[PDB]
Ligand binder design. Structure first.
Ligand SMILES: Cc1ccc([C@H](O)P(=O)(O)O)cc1
Length: 300
């Protein structure tokens, strides 16, 4: 069956704890062996959205678990659109998107994790981090001079930023995700992997669209110029912060419809392990319902 092939491919996208990461050689940004048509996919995507809505409903009705979903990617990989599409099928009462832009003055007066801890999802809720605490081992690692401006970093000279500084930050991130995992939070992390070539194409496509080129950030080019620096940061990060408890998935991003299918797919598959069920109606409650129905019928 097609889905059976998909479940098999999906597992190759999970980053294993001991796994070493080369984003250049491995992790195709576009899956050629695509096992279903773009049509099939948009229909399996619809099912994934409906199922996720069902899961979210059952999650909200129970008071047990929260769900944290992290999205990281290079500009133009499809992150905002994946978030928007995940959302279309969710109830806004039980889901919350936080887009972590550049930190505020207050947030800079706290450790780099503080503002993400503040924004964690409550029991029964889904939290989506569009950008996340991982920015602090990515953009900060490509631009290590930012750490000098961060009062809590304890970094005075760029000389002291080395692999051991990042190792300690991975440890801090891992202890943080482990703690919340041990206290009811399901953590799922997606890196949307777009090719340097496809980013180029999408950048140019936007520049040439009058309806949308007002949105183009030419500063995105400065980060594109640091492509190799970012791949290294992502590689070292994926190799050191994917656990079985809080796994990373590397999603091919060059085909948006397929990116969305996979992420919807993985979220459903992972949250189905919770074996969530709608609340059942006891005999006492069934009696109360029939009493209420009787009164409504017995109205003058
Ligand atoms: C060219 C271009 C398209 C879409 C976007 C979105 O903001 P994302 O795919 O980075 O979330 C950014 C740049």
């Amino acid at each position: 069956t097609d889905f059976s092939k998909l479940s098999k491919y999906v597992e190759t996208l999970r980053v294993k704890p001991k796994q070493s990461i080369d984003l250049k050689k491995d992790f195709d940004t576009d899956y050629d062996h695509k096992m279903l048509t773009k049509e099939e996919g948009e229909e399996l995507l619809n099912l994934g959205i409906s199922k996720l809505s069902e899961i979210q409903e059952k999650l909200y009705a129970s008071g047990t678990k929260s769900v944290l979903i992290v999205f990281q990617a290079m500009d133009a990989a499809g992150k905002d659109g994946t978030v928007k599409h995940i959302m279309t099928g969710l109830n806004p009462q039980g889901v919350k998107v936080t887009s972590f832009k550049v930190p505020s003055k207050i947030e800079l007066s706290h450790d780099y994790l503080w503002r993400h801890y503040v924004a964690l999802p409550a029991t029964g809720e889904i939290g989506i981090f569009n950008r996340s605490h991982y920015e602090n081992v990515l953009v900060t690692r490509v631009h290590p001079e930012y750490l000098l401006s961060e009062q809590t970093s304890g970094v005075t000279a760029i000389e002291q930023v080395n692999q051991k500084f990042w190792d300690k930050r991975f440890q801090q991130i891992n202890n943080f995700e482990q703690h919340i995992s041990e206290n009811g939070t399901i953590v799922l992390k997606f890196f949307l992997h777009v090719s340097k070539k496809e980013q180029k194409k999408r950048f140019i496509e936007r520049i040439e669209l009058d309806t949308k080129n007002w949105k183009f950030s030419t500063g995105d080019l400065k980060e594109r110029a640091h492509w190799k620096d970012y791949r290294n940061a992502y590689e070292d990060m994926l190799a050191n912060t994917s656990t079985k408890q809080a796994p990373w998935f590397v999603i091919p991003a060059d085909d948006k419809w397929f990116t969305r299918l996979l992420i919807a797919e993985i979220i459903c598959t992972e949250l189905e392990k919770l074996n969530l069920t709608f609340p059942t109606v006891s005999l006492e409650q069934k009696a109360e319902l029939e009493k209420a129905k009787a009164e409504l019928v017995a109205e003058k």
